[PDB]
């Protein structure tokens, strides 16, 4: 037992093991212990997959680097990519041209989109909604409740939902319950009534439809989704609009101005309301767990400058808040070697001393698995994994020897408190919690009947709640910010600027033979780097810090605990043998463990 | 009474289950309802831990024979197979354990089918496709960084309609998708007969849609449906929105030197 950032972590209670953990992009194992109560005192986060894409990287071509680094993960697809230009770019001095810029902001915001309304609905949605409680709704009740949640959605009838029931009981009666087998329900962990769970698995099944037309934005600009293609340089969709013989032309553009409108309809009207509606029945229930780091720690690099290379203009506008204290946002710089740093002593990698942290550019990737001497089972075969000796693939990366919790919640409190000092570019972030915390706190309980709260953002954002809340507002931003883009584009292209590519250092012998660049995205899960060093036309080295590496880290030289670790202590579970609160928690994060671990 | 299909993940991205999902003909929604009955998938089943493990045992006894086992990622060999772990056991392990009883056994995208990103130079998670591992069962190798998506509910759909495998080729893959060279119907083909190319990103040429051979496009020695079939309900492939293929349903194409660096004898294509 020992104290660390205000945790007091005990493990003599009873460990119970998740792994499988199920409904995350990759492979986790989650070890907990409870004491009497059933209260989570100590949680283990261990990421169990590695492929080494840092190692394979080394001696290629950095102009190859993007597709290599894409396939750390098709979920948040394309994200590495364009960290990677971006990160040879840098090296290179290579700046793209606007129409490049403009592209890339597109896909990156539809890849939010598509990702964090898939993340909520087909990942996320059953932690909180009992499928089997949806058969027993009332379609009449159901229609009066889609109503109330979000009145300009169209599909209300009570029909509709009849019908959508009914398929769900055949389903059922089957025998053959497909992905709802040996499922949670009926635990009292689900507090929703039948009617708010047939409106959620309605949605769940409309976004399994609508998704699909989403990402025919990346196949546009990027020939296909997953893993669109991007380019050292700026993008290769030329454009040509005198014309059918180009990537792009005017007919395209308004192709992906057509499926932006449909993403704007879909966040304002079904994704939206859903998690204030299912925010507010789980805050009713008093359902505030899971704030972890949130409370204190969060980080972001900032991202989407409304000017190009201008990061004054960032739209989710970044930097380290610590202790808690939303008055004070430290700039954060990826590429001074104090700032961000991993270690390994709690994971499963060497150092030539692993008393410290290596920033990227400095980073090593050896593996070392070995278990502790505490471990219960074998080394093909564990039953406990030893938390105290190296326990996990994932690295512990660290903001001046700070644990931080990075993400869309981190992106939106540091929006918050930037809009709080003056900051104009984050004034839409802060309108949507202003706007959010007043639905939860009373205008959907007047609604629904139930007694109003009094809650703060202070109060309300770290929590699970709050970090679900976070993601769906981020989706919506998102949608509207590229519609903006697209009308820039537009607008550039007419003007007479059809450019898409800088070729000026294509070619490796313009390139200087020694040069280190460094690429930072706003990833769906939160805060992404690669760090790059090149030498004679070849990668030296390449280290990938990814936000599940952040999230889902384990404990760094100091112990000090990661996110994941932190949002799991203090809960109380309703049965010890059911990891619905342990499953609801880490999805809130929306693990993608391929990514964490590369 | 709909096919049991057991879903496993190795070492992989999850591309493919993200593009079976993109599937508009069939939907995958009615795969999933009215098609098959996916009892085990760790994207998107509601159980973890004890409770998903319990899945595989009911429905292999249930359906001993009777199940299809789709396979994406892949096992690695080194760190005693701990670099991939699935209930404190290496991957390998289920693998071979659900692979005894299976009717079929699907390997999805080039990760399953031949090894992928992971198995590239210089491999260090030994990262082994699936038909190197299980040697006495029936494999269909469906390749593809990730294959399209109505090429993995094609095989699916062929699968239930008729209970056999697809014809194919001598290295696995169903002829119904993987028979054409993309450079056999690629749009770009009559700029390649007259010698046009693209020779710079963005230059007049790629302006014109000229073809992308010397900007490396590995189209000539690629099988897919990419240029028929094409991408996300036929909207675009990768040659169509300006980047040459980069083969990525070729086995070992991580290491057949740079994306942008022609093929060699153009005579020959
Ligand atoms: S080389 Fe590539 S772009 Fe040119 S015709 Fe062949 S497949 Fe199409
Ligand atoms: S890169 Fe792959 S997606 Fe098709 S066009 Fe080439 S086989
Ligand atoms: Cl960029
Ligand atoms: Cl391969
Ligand atoms: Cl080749
Ligand atoms: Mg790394
Ligand atoms: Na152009």
């Known amino acids: ?89 840098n090296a290179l001095d290579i700046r793209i041209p606007k129409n490049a810029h403009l592209i890339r902001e597109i896909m990156a915001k539809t890849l939010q989109v598509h990702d964090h309304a898939v993340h909520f609905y087909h990942l996320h949605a059953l932690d909180w909604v009992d499928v089997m409680s949806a058969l027993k709704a009332d379609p009449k009740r159901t229609s009066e409740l889609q109503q109330l949640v979000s009145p300009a959605h169209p599909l209300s009838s009570a029909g509709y939902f009849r019908d959508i029931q009914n398929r769900l009981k055949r389903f059922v009666e089957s025998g053959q319950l497909g992905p709802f087998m040996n499922g949670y329900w009926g635990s009292k962990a689900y507090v929703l009534p039948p009617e708010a769970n047939l409106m959620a698995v309605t949605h769940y099944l409309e976004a399994l439809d609508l998704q699909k037309e989403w990402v025919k934005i990346h196949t546009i600009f990027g020939g296909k989704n997953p893993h669109p293609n991007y380019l050292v340089g700026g993008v290769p969709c030329a454009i040509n609009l005198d014309a ?75 930097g380290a808040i610590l202790n808690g204290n939303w008055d004070e946002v430290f700039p954060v710089d990826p590429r001074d070697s104090q700032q961000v740093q991993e270690f390994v002593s709690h994971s499963w990698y060497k150092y030539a001393d692993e008393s410290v942290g290596l920033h990227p550019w400095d980073g090593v990737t050896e593996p070392n698995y070995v278990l502790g001497a505490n471990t219960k089972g074998t080394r093909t075969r564990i039953e406990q994994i030893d938390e105290s000796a190296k326990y996990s ?69 770290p929590s699970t709640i709050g970090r679900t809340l976070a993601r769906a507002l981020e989706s919506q931003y998102c949608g509207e910010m590229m519609h903006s883009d697209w009308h820039d584009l537009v607008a550039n292209i007419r003007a007479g600027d059809t450019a898409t590519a800088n070729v000026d250092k294509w070619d490796p012998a313009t390139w200087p033979l020694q040069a280190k660049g460094v690429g930072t995205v706003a990833a769906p899960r939160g805060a992404l780097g690669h760090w790059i060093r090149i030498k004679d036309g070849r990668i030296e080295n390449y280290q990938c810090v ?42 809130s994060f929306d693990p993608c463990l391929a990514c964490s671990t590369h | 009474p709909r096919t049991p299909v057991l879903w496993l993940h190795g070492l992989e991205c999850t591309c493919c289950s ?174 390649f007969d007259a010698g046009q190319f693209v020779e710079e990103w963005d230059d007049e040429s790629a302006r014109k849609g000229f073809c992308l051979y010397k900007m490396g496009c590995k189209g000539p020695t690629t099988y897919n449906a990419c240029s028929t079939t094409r991408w996300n309900e036929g909207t675009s492939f990768p040659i169509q929105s300006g980047h040459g293929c980069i083969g990525c349903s070729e086995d070992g194409f991580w290491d057949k030197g740079s994306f942008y660096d022609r093929l060699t004898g153009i005579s020959q294509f």
Request: hydrophobic residues 40%.
């Open chain 1, 393 to 461: 693939w994932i690295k512990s990366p660290r903001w001046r020897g700070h644990a931080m919790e990075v993400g869309p919640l981190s992106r939106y409190i540091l929006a918050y408190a930037h809009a709080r000092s003056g900051n104009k570019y984050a004034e839409r972030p802060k309108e949507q919690l202003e706007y959010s915390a007043q639905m939860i706190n009373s205008a959907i309980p007047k609604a629904l009947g139930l007694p109003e709260t009094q809650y703060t953002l202070k109060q309300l954002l």
């Open chain 2, 18 to 191: 993200e593009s079976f999902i993109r599937s508009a003909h069939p939907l995958a929604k009615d795969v999933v309802l009215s098609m098959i009955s996916l009892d085990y998938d760790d994207t998107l089943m509601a159980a973890a831990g004890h409770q998903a493990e319990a899945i595989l045992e009911e429905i292999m006894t249930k359906y001993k024979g009777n199940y299809i086992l789709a396979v994406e990622g892949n096992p690695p060999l080194n760190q005693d197979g701990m670099s991939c772990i699935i209930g404190g056991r290496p991957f390998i392990e289920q693998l071979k354990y659900v692979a005894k009883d299976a009717k079929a056994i699907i390997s999805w995208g080039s990760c399953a089918s031949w090894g992928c990103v992971q198995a590239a130079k210089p491999n260090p998670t030994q990262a082994t496709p699936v038909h190197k591992v299980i040697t006495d069962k029936p494999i269909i190798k469906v390749p593809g960084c990730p294959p399209i998506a109505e090429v993995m509910t094609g095989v699916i759909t062929y699968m239930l309609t008729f209970d056999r495998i697809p014809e194919l080729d001598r290295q696995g893959r169903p002829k119904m998708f993987y028979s054409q060279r993309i450079h056999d119907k690629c749009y770009r083909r009559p700029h």
């Open chain 1, 1 to 89: 037992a020992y104290a660390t950032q205000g945790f007091n972590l005990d493990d003599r209670g009873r460990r119970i093991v998740v792994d499988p953990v199920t409904r995350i992009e990759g492979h986790m194992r989650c070890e907990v212990n409870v004491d009497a109560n059933n209260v989570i005192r100590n949680a283990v986060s261990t990421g169990t997959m590695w492929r080494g894409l840092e190692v394979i990287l080394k001696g290629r071509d950095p102009r190859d680097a993007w597709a290599f680094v894409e396939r750390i993960c098709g979920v948040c697809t394309g994200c590495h990519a364009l960290a990677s230009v971006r990160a040879v770019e």
């Open chain 1, 546 to 587: 990814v936000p599940t590496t952040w999230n889902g880290s384990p404990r760094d030289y100091k112990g000090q605990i990661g996110a994941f670790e932190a949002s799991l202590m203090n809960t109380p579970m309703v049965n010890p043998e059911q990891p619905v609160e342990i499953l609801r928690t880490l999805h």
């Open chain 1, 244 to 318: 059918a013989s180009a990537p792009v032309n005017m007919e395209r553009l308004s192709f992906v101005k057509a499926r932006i409108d449909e993403i704007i309809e879909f966040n304002k009207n079904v994704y939206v309301p859903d998690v204030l509606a299912i925010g507010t029945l789980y805050k009713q229930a008093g359902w505030l767990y899971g704030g972890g780091l949130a409370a204190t720690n969060v980080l972001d690099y900032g991202e989407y400058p409304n000017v190009a290379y201008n990061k004054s203009t960032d739209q989710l506008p970044g």
